[PDB]
């Protein structure tokens, strides 16, 4: 059903748990993000850590119904709680609330004040909101609404089932080493405290994030959501400046937080070089992989923890969120890991993981598909010239030795490429008939224009659009994540785009 234009507004794919919505122009791309009410009202719907989902803001009205006049859902009360301390409430903040026979957890905000904002920031960053599935199931067993989104699950252990298919994709002894999350972020999230809290004793408080990452990683540490200092190595190939500053806090250094590739620069960094780095810092190196997959590139005997965000390739719904955290057996953090681990995050909501098992049953498949037609959508850009000033992307020119290093032998570059247009956007997205809108790793193609999604507020200003130039980025940038079409067909549906 990919390749095809989606009217401005429909939830994409469709279903109710859908995590992405069409937003086909560059107009309705700057009202949404500018928050305009006009563009909003015609596109309420976006992604779950980003705008709440219509059944978790009215399971939110009713249970403040039952004092009673903004109420903030979590996934758990360990959620809330961290969102409350964060945001600088007083403890009872947090609150468990109760309807349909469920229990709820939330953080009551305060009207004025920046209180709100922070707790919002904090669910946000980290993934710990309240998931639709369940949301809908509280409405569900309290008769509020009539009936429930029919989709493919597994239900039989789901948990045990993921854990199983990522240990042998990741190349680890069994599901012990893999550790469910309540979505990527909620997963790099509980990895970065985890190591933090190892690292403490030994007066490590420090951390170094190479390159720039995605933007949620980014906020962690920016807004000390991680209460963590840390420094920015801008240049994910410039090993020198990562070692110079790594000697610079010698001893100081509790970990190195990377992406291969990265999120949306899509550089790829030198794994091998960092973990000699990260071994003579004694500090942990942490991966997070879900652009390559591990279904592409083997960096367990490199990293001593891996994230990845199983809502993207792993499941290929678009419908679900989910992450995981991967411990290297190898690692000297291991058994500490393995030990602490448990005390952040959160697992999902076990319909959640459910649908996430039915779905990863296909991943390796997936991939093979996905692979050939990132490489065939790259020749296809390579001869627009006049349009597609250059392509970043992890067999580029930049990046392809790096990723050769961790290269499985059946291995590709993934299903992402960044174009970087020498035209204004609106002439190439919005007459581009893929699906259009946030997120990306579905089965069908999606593109993003994803410098607007990660930092519109740079894009408004003179100062804003040289601080982004300075990342290697600019307005006229389209994020292209390639589903498991034909690939003659995606490469048709491009070439049109692109004259
Ligand atoms: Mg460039």
Same mark, same amino acid.
């Given at each position: 059903?990919?390749?095809?234009?989606?009217?401005?507004?429909?939830?994409?794919?469709?279903?109710?748990?859908?995590?992405?919505?069409?937003?086909?122009?560059?107009?309705?791309?700057?009202?949404?993000?500018?928050?305009?009410?006009?563009?909003?009202?015609?596109?309420?719907?976006?992604?779950?850590?980003?705008?709440?989902?219509?059944?978790?803001?009215?399971?939110?009205?009713?249970?403040?119904?039952?004092?009673?006049?903004?109420?903030?859902?979590?996934? %758990?009360? @360990?959620? *809330?709680?961290?969102?409350?301390?964060? +945001? =600088? #409430?007083?403890? !009872?903040?947090?609150?468990?609330? /109760?309807?349909?026979?469920?229990?709820?957890?939330?953080?009551?905000?305060?009207?004025?004040?920046?209180?709100?904002?922070?707790?919002?920031?904090?669910?946000?960053?980290?993934?710990?909101?309240? %998931?639709? @599935?369940? *949301?809908?199931?509280?409405?569900?067993? +309290? =008769? #509020?609404?009539? !009936?429930?989104?029919?989709?493919? /699950?597994?239900?039989?252990?789901?948990?045990?089932?993921?854990?199983?298919?990522?240990?042998?994709?990741?190349?680890?002894?069994?599901?012990?080493?893999?550790?469910?999350?309540?979505?990527?972020?909620?997963?790099?999230? *509980?990895?970065?405290?985890?190591?933090?809290?190892?690292?403490?004793?030994?007066?490590?408080?420090?951390?170094?994030?190479?390159?720039?990452?995605?933007?949620?990683?980014?906020?962690?540490?920016?807004?000390?959501?991680?209460?963590?200092?840390?420094?920015?190595?801008?240049?994910?190939?410039?090993?020198?400046?990562?070692?110079?500053?790594?000697?610079?806090?010698?001893?100081?250094?509790?970990?190195?937080?990377?992406?291969?590739?990265?999120?949306?620069?899509?550089?790829?960094?030198?794994?091998?070089?960092?973990?000699?780095?990260?071994?003579?810092?004694?500090?942990?190196?942490?991966?997070?992989?879900?652009?390559?997959?591990?279904?592409?590139?083997?960096?367990?005997?490199?990293?001593?923890?891996?994230?990845?965000?199983?809502?993207?390739?792993?499941?290929?719904?678009?419908?679900?969120?989910?992450?995981?955290?991967?411990?290297?057996?190898?690692?000297?953090?291991?058994?500490?890991?393995?030990?602490?681990?448990?005390?952040?995050?959160?697992?999902?909501?076990?319909?959640?993981?459910?649908?996430?098992?039915?779905?990863?049953?296909?991943?390796?498949?997936?991939?093979?598909?996905?692979?050939?037609?990132?490489?065939?959508?790259?020749?296809?850009?390579?001869?627009?010239?006049?349009?597609?000033?250059?392509?970043?992307?992890?067999?580029?020119?930049?990046?392809?030795?790096?990723?050769?290093?961790?290269?499985?032998?059946?291995?590709?570059?993934?299903?992402?490429?960044?174009?970087?247009?020498?035209?204004?956007?609106?002439?190439?997205?919005?007459?581009?008939?893929?699906?259009?809108?946030?997120?990306?790793?579905?089965?069908?193609?999606?593109?993003?224009?994803?410098?607007?999604?990660?930092?519109?507020?740079?894009?408004?200003?003179?100062?804003?659009?040289?601080?982004?130039?300075?990342?290697?980025?600019?307005?006229?940038?389209?994020?292209?994540?390639?589903?498991?079409?034909?690939?003659?067909?995606?490469?048709?549906?491009?070439?049109?785009?692109?004259?």
């Amino acid at each position: 059903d990919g390749l095809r234009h989606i009217a401005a507004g429909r939830p994409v794919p469709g279903s109710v748990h859908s995590v992405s919505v069409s937003i086909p122009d560059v107009a309705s791309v700057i009202g949404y993000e500018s928050n305009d009410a006009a563009t909003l009202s015609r596109i309420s719907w976006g992604y779950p850590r980003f705008r709440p989902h219509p059944y978790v803001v009215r399971v939110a009205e009713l249970a403040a119904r039952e004092e009673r006049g903004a109420l903030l859902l979590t996934r %758990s009360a @360990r959620a *809330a709680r961290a969102a409350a301390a964060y +945001a =600088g #409430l007083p403890p !009872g903040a947090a609150r468990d609330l /109760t309807l349909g026979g469920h229990v709820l957890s939330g953080v009551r905000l305060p009207d004025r004040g920046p209180g709100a904002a922070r707790a919002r920031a904090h669910v946000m960053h980290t993934g710990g909101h309240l %998931s639709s @599935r369940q *949301a809908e199931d509280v409405l569900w067993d +309290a =008769g #509020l609404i009539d !009936g429930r989104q029919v989709e493919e /699950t597994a239900d039989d252990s789901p948990a045990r089932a993921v854990a199983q298919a990522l240990a042998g994709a990741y190349g680890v002894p069994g599901p012990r080493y893999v550790a469910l999350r309540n979505s990527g972020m909620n997963a790099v999230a *509980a990895a970065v405290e985890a190591v933090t809290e190892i690292q403490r004793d030994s007066g490590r408080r420090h951390w170094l994030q190479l390159g720039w990452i995605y933007f949620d990683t980014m906020h962690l540490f920016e807004k000390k959501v991680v209460n963590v200092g840390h420094t920015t190595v801008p240049d994910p190939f410039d090993l020198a400046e990562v070692a110079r500053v790594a000697a610079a806090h010698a001893g100081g250094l509790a970990g190195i937080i990377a992406e291969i590739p990265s999120n949306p620069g899509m550089g790829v960094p030198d794994l091998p070089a960092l973990r000699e780095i990260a071994d003579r810092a004694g500090c942990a190196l942490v991966v997070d992989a879900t652009i390559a997959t591990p279904h592409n590139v083997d960096v367990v005997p490199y990293a001593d923890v891996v994230c990845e965000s199983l809502t993207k390739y792993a499941t290929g719904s678009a419908d679900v969120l989910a992450g995981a955290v991967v411990v290297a057996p190898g690692s000297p953090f291991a058994a500490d890991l393995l030990t602490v681990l448990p005390r952040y995050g959160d697992e999902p909501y076990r319909r959640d993981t459910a649908r996430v098992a039915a779905r990863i049953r296909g991943y390796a498949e997936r991939m093979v598909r996905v692979n050939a037609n990132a490489l065939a959508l790259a020749e296809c850009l390579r001869r627009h010239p006049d349009v597609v000033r250059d392509t970043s992307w992890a067999l580029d020119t930049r990046s392809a030795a790096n990723y050769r290093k961790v290269a499985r032998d059946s291995g590709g570059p993934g299903g992402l490429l960044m174009v970087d247009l020498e035209v204004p956007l609106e002439l190439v997205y919005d007459r581009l008939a893929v699906a259009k809108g946030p997120s990306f790793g579905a089965e069908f193609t999606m593109a993003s224009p994803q410098v607007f999604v990660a930092h519109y507020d740079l894009l408004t200003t003179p100062r804003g659009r040289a601080a982004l130039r300075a990342r290697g980025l600019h307005r006229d940038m389209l994020r292209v994540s390639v589903g498991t079409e034909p690939p003659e067909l995606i490469v048709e549906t491009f070439e049109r785009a692109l004259r």
